[PDB]
Design an enzyme around this catalytic site. Structure first.
Site, mmCIF file in Angstrom:
data_model
loop_
_atom_site.group_PDB
_atom_site.id
_atom_site.type_symbol
_atom_site.label_atom_id
_atom_site.label_comp_id
_atom_site.label_asym_id
_atom_site.label_seq_id
_atom_site.Cartn_x
_atom_site.Cartn_y
_atom_site.Cartn_z
ATOM 1 N N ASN A 150 -57.612 9.877 53.997
ATOM 2 C CA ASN A 150 -57.079 8.680 52.890
ATOM 3 C C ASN A 150 -56.789 7.752 53.863
ATOM 4 O OD1 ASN A 150 -55.187 8.781 54.923
ATOM 5 N ND2 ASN A 150 -53.087 10.358 53.851
ATOM 6 N N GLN B 132 -65.238 13.144 60.710
ATOM 7 C CA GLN B 132 -64.822 12.730 59.674
ATOM 8 C C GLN B 132 -66.201 13.164 58.765
ATOM 9 O OE1 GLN B 132 -61.632 10.429 57.710
ATOM 10 N NE2 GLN B 132 -63.317 8.975 56.818
ATOM 11 N N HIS C 69 -49.903 11.476 56.336
ATOM 12 C CA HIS C 69 -51.316 12.693 56.572
ATOM 13 C C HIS C 69 -50.829 13.788 56.493
ATOM 14 C CE1 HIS C 69 -55.276 12.924 58.066
ATOM 15 N NE2 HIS C 69 -54.782 14.806 59.152
ATOM 16 N N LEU D 246 -49.420 11.113 64.644
ATOM 17 C CA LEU D 246 -50.883 11.443 63.555
ATOM 18 C C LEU D 246 -49.684 12.084 62.074
ATOM 19 C CD1 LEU D 246 -54.184 11.429 63.657
ATOM 20 C CD2 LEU D 246 -53.117 11.948 61.329
ATOM 21 N N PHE E 233 -61.430 15.718 58.295
ATOM 22 C CA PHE E 233 -61.717 16.076 59.648
ATOM 23 C C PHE E 233 -60.817 17.305 60.335
ATOM 24 C CE2 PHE E 233 -57.789 14.345 61.752
ATOM 25 C CZ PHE E 233 -57.122 14.858 61.216
#
Lengths: 301, 155, 134, 332, 50, 154, 43, 49
Positions: free
Chosen positions: F91, F52, F115, F111, F102
């Site tokens: 976020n 990130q 997202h 995930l 990322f």
């Protein structure tokens, strides 16, 4: 957003917990005192250094009040006394006696009139030269904080009962109570104009009441949560801003609280090492003063 | 400005404004001549009859043939001169074009950034003043209520 | 790339001192001949105010058909008409913008009159409310 | 740049107007619910005591008793010109109560004018005949000309240029002719402003045709009234105006062109004509009331029999000059 | 540049105008405090018997 | 839609899924055009989880999009984290995407909810595989500044 | 029959005077606040 | 030192032979080309004479 040299200024001094630190009415000076039986005088603008110490008090400075003349200082001591300190020369002017316990709070009038309460369940009003209590009011439970109206006939005294007593000095009629609190009232402060009263109590709620002869029932305006009191039963202060639109308070949870007088929390800023006894706002600029039981006093915006 | 308004209020205010308005109340000479001429388009005409290639006739045929020959020779010279160098000049024109394009877009983005900054400072100032007047009118209304209730309560 | 007067590409651009802007020699010279001043700044100007600077010059690429010939005279007439029509559009734009400006100014003055009148009515209305309260 | 700045100032001021009117009306409702629970000029005192000053019957012929107008000379108030129905313009002098001049032409005259030189006068007749007939000569020297009745008469300050209005939406100018066929609204009331730069003309449908005198193009319409408005007259001090209709008397302002005063009367009572001294005002009709114009029933004189066709103020304001359709002339 | 110059002019006009509104609000605030002061003196004359 | 990322380790090439999620790629494209990403640290590196970065302050918080504070994500079923190299956004709430992003190094099927997925790295994957092996202190933060020199959009 | 040209065009960017600002007005304050706070560290 | 003040406010043109100063430059170029041709051929004419 002010004339301060630094946005945040730490003040180091005193040898014990500092209990009170009050601005000069002019907004140019201020003094501090606490458990070290000493009063320190400061300069608001410039190098911010001491220019005098007020030695001679034989007890902790529970409270003190600046004079409108900005030339004499009145200090309340835990040793059942009330000294008058000449700020510009530092000698003993007078020592007012008559209480029978620790004098908790003090307030001054627009006219040289002083008022105080102590653990002997009494309130005494003093002339600046009489050296004796011209009027005395007896209650059943010890009183904790006072507020004198600048007009000069009503005094609000808060004590153990959790109900504010309003006393008319001339009338001596007391059948008017500002009920609503449920525990010990730590501090009271009158608005600049004399219409609203700020109350803080150990029942964890900071409330605001109106000070007028006439009301539409439920004189309670609003309450604020969050400001919590610890188990040390300290006397936490509250303050009125120069515009009387931001109300301030200190809490034993290491928090300085500023509200918008409309129920919306505005400042939550931490920064203290101990319970914060007193909080005050500058009468001209947007400075906020902090005073904690950790031998230190914070500057503000 | 900071406010919650419907367009009907805007139209009502505009109709009030229209009602109140009702109640209250160089160039040369050749250019001017040709302008009064072609104000109705009137595209000016000139001879393009040099491709008809008039057949054998009078001297006019000779004149057209000779002028066409001379035009052809000049056209030969100009086009061969064009292909001597190729399109390097065209590449330079496109490169200078993209240079100026980028120089313009840089100042355009600078200008929109400045406009956004002016907007945000304006919106901040309006917010603080509008909040102040909002609390002002609220306390005015509470004050009116207090005054009227006090006055009736005195009786 | 474009002379600030007509938008033309100045093969010999110049920059001034009071207000450096790209300008073409002949047009500023004719302005000086008309009025010996600069209308951009309303100040006196001399022939030396321009400085001949060095530029790579703007290459002028020829269209598919521009080789002398009546193509050149057709272009003569076409650009005559084009610049003249630009002139007409810009003149009528003058007339429309000025008439619209006059109308807008009249509406604005009437708006000022009515906001003053309405403000006065506010003052009497506020005072009427306050005086009712007694 | 100037246009965009002006337009955006208009939008800002428009928002000002919007909020302004909004909580103004809010507070008006709030209050409504709250309260629920020249030294020589005659003074008002002397004018209010006005009564009958003369009784003239010999001035107008009784064979055809009717009048439609009354004109007074500014230089000599003794000369009165009531328009007679015998198709004769009678010029009379109040001092002798005699018809000093008689001008004979077949229709009842509707309007008359008097100059400041004691010699020039004009008259209008139902026969589409308007003539500037001098009283001294007692004869018509000019002719003003149709197929419909003329609704209004006007003249330039020079006294020779003449403007007339008819009910066919056509007007006669003594070197142009502007015709409006988009509205086609007849008119009944009109007058000439003493400044002379513009004028107004009330119409039958209630709209007001406000036009510049020099340009001769209408630029304003005021239509808040109903029914034919009988008359409208501008004042002399500049900011006093008066209008009347077939049922109240109202006062206006020249700059604002909006109502500034209203004298309410019953529907059956209709005013006819109004007179201005901006010091004092006079009215005639079914209910006769004279009110002070400067300070906005103050006078009640009923000595005029029949329907009073016109009222005028004489010199020194000691008495009025009113005529009726009963062939009577009573001075107030 | 059109809207930039327009924003400049409107900013100048607003910075000029808002002080007048604030001053008028303060003036009417002072008057309303005075009238309420008179009202509360009257109720205090009532209160003298309490 | 194509952006070259001159990172400190090497070259990262990304293609933006304009056809899939248009709103979340326009800000990135115009953000590479402005190029205020110069000298921005890759503040977070977790072995086989993410890299990130993208905040001007470098403290792992902040970063302003063109909308200024945050925008609303758009997700659809066929988007998935099945691979290693998918370029996604960051976020801190329901719809609180900020300027940082990322790159995935492993399948993360858990995930793919709140997202958004908006990129696939076509070249420079080796660079991310080595980014997975970067010196890291107790927090998932490289000791040395893992700046990005500069980024062209192309 | 109203003056649509004089009103719609007038309110075209007049609403944008309050709308276009709200986009970048939530950008500078966020970064400035974070820079002011985190420059002073967690303590 | 004079920074660049390119933006200005006026409307540019294509840098080609499609503007009247440029087009007139091409006009005089055609004219001097045929003029140069006449020069060389008149030298040849006088030598041949």
């Amino acid at each position: 957003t002010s004339d301060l040299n630094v946005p945040n200024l730490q003040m180091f001094g005193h040898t014990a917990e500092v209990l009170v630190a009050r601005f000069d009415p002019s907004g140019s000076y201020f003094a501090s005192g606490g458990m070290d039986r000493q009063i320190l005088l400061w300069n608001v603008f410039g190098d911010v250094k001491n220019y005098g110490v007020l030695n001679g008090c034989k007890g902790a400075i529970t409270d003190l009040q600046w004079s409108r003349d900005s030339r004499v200082v009145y200090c309340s001591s835990s040793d059942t006394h009330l000294m008058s300190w000449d700020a510009v020369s530092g000698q003993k002017i007078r020592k007012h006696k008559g209480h029978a316990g620790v004098v908790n709070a003090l307030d001054v009038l627009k006219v040289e009139l002083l008022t105080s309460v102590s653990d002997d369940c009494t309130m005494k009003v003093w002339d600046s030269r009489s050296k004796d209590c011209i009027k005395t009011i007896e209650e059943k439970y010890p009183l904790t904080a006072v507020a004198i109206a600048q007009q000069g006939t009503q005094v609000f005294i808060g004590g153990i009962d959790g109900a504010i007593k309003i006393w008319d000095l001339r009338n001596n009629h007391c059948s008017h109570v500002l009920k609503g609190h449920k525990d010990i009232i730590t501090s009271l402060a009158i608005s600049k104009d004399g219409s609203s009263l700020l109350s803080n109590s150990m029942d964890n709620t900071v409330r605001i009441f109106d000070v007028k002869p006439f009301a539409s029932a439920q004189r309670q305006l609003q309450i604020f949560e969050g400001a919590i009191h610890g188990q040390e039963h300290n006397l936490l202060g509250v303050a009125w801003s120069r515009n009387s639109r931001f109300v301030g308070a200190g809490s034993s949870d290491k928090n300085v609280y500023v509200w918008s007088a409309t129920g919306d929390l505005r400042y939550v800023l931490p920064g203290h090492e101990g319970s914060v006894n007193h909080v005050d706002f500058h009468p001209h600029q947007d400075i906020i003063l902090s005073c904690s039981s950790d031998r230190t006093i914070f500057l503000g915006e | 400005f900071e406010s919650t308004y419907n367009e009907e209020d805007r139209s009502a205010a505009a109709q009030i404004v229209e009602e109140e308005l009702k109640r209250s109340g160089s160039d040369r000479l050749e250019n001017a001549i040709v302008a009064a001429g072609k104000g109705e388009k009137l595209a000016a005409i000139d001879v393009q009859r040099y491709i008809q290639l008039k057949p054998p006739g009078t001297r006019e045929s000779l004149l057209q043939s000779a002028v066409v020959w001379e035009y052809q020779k000049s056209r030969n010279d100009n086009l061969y001169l064009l292909e001597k160098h190729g399109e390097k000049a065209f590449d330079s024109s496109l490169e200078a074009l993209e240079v100026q394009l980028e120089l313009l877009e840089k100042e355009l983005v600078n200008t929109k950034k400045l406009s956004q900054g002016c907007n945000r400072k304006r919106k901040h100032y309006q917010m603080e003043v509008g909040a102040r007047l909002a609390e002002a009118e609220v306390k005015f209304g509470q004050l009116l209520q207090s005054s009227i209730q006090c006055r009736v309560a005195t009786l | 790339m474009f002379c600030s007067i007509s938008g033309e590409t100045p093969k010999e651009p110049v920059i001034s001192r009071v207000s450096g802007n790209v300008y073409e020699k002949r047009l500023i010279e004719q302005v000086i001949r008309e009025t010996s001043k600069d209308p951009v700044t309303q100040q006196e100007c001399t022939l030396e105010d321009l400085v001949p600077v060095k530029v790579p010059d703007f290459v002028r690429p020829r269209p598919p058909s521009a080789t002398s010939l009546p193509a050149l005279l057709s272009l003569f007439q076409e650009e005559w008409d084009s610049v003249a029509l630009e002139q007409f559009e810009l003149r009528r734009n003058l007339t429309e913008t000025k008439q619209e400006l006059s109308t807008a100014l009249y509406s604005l003055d009437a708006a000022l009159r009515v906001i003053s009148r309405l403000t006065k009515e506010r003052d009497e209305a506020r005072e009427a409310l306050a005086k009712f309260s007694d | 740049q100037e246009l965009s700045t002006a337009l955006y100032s208009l939008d800002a001021a428009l928002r000002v107007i919007s909020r302004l009117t909004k909580e103004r009306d809010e507070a008006r409702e709030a209050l409504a619910k709250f309260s629920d629970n020249l030294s020589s000029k005659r003074k008002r005192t002397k004018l209010q005591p006005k009564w009958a000053t003369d009784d003239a019957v010999s001035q107008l012929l009784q064979a055809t008793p009717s009048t439609i107008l009354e004109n007074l000379e500014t230089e000599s108030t003794t000369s009165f010109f009531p328009s007679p129905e015998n198709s004769s313009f009678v010029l009379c002098l109040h001092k002798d109560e005699l018809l000093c001049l008689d001008i004979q032409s077949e229709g009842s005259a509707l309007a008359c004018c008097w100059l400041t030189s004691s010699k020039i006068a004009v008259a209008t007749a139902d026969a589409i005949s308007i003539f500037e007939f001098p009283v001294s000569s007692s004869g018509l020297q000019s002719v003003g000309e149709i197929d419909e009745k003329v609704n209004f008469l006007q003249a330039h300050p020079s006294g020779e240029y003449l403007l007339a209005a008819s009910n066919e939406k056509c007007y006669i100018f003594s070197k142009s002719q502007v015709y409006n066929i988009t509205v086609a609204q007849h008119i009944t009331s009109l007058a000439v402003h003493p400044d002379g730069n513009l004028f107004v003309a009330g119409l039958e449908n209630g709209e007001l045709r406000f036009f510049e005198t020099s340009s001769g193009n209408e630029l304003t319409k005021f239509g808040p009234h109903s029914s034919p408005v009988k008359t409208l007259q501008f004042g002399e001090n500049g900011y006093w105006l008066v209008v009347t209709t077939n049922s109240d008397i109202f006062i206006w302002d020249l700059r604002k062109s909006e109502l500034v005063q209203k004298i309410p009367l019953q529907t059956k009572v209709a005013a006819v004509s109004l007179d201005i001294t901006q010091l004092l005002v006079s009215s005639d009709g079914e209910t006769l009331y004279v009110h002070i114009y400067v300070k906005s029933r103050c006078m009640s004189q009923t000595h005029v029999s029949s329907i009073s066709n016109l009222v005028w103020l004489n010199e020194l304001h000691q008495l009025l000059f009113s005529t009726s359709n009963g062939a009577i002339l009573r001075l107030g | 540049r059109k809207n930039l110059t327009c924003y400049e002019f409107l900013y100048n006009q607003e910075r000029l105008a808002l002080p007048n509104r604030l001053e008028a609000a303060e003036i009417e605030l002072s008057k309303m405090q005075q009238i309420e002061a008179y009202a509360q003196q009257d109720y205090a004359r009532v209160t003298g018997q309490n | 839609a194509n952006v070259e990322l001159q990172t400190s380790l090497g070259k990262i090439l990304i293609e933006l899924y304009t056809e899939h999620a248009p709103k979340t790629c326009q800000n990135f494209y115009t953000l590479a055009k402005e190029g205020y990403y110069d000298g921005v640290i890759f503040h977070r590196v977790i072995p086989d989880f993410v890299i990130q970065g993208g905040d001007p302050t470098g403290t792992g918080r902040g970063g302003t999009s063109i909308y200024g504070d945050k925008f609303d994500d758009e997700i659809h079923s066929d988007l998935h984290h099945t691979g290693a190299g998918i370029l996604s956004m960051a976020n801190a709430g329901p719809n609180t995407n900020s300027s940082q992003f990322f790159i995935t190094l492993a399948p993360t099927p858990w995930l793919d909810g709140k997202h958004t997925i908006f990129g696939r790295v076509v070249s420079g994957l080796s660079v991310c595989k080595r980014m997975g092996l970067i010196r890291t202190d107790s927090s998932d933060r490289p000791i040395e500044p893992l700046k990005i020199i500069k980024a062209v959009a192309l | 029959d109203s003056e649509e040209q004089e009103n719609s065009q007038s309110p075209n960017i007049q609403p944008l005077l309050h709308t276009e600002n709200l986009a970048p007005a939530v950008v500078d304050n966020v970064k400035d606040d974070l820079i002011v706070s985190k420059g002073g560290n967690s303590r």
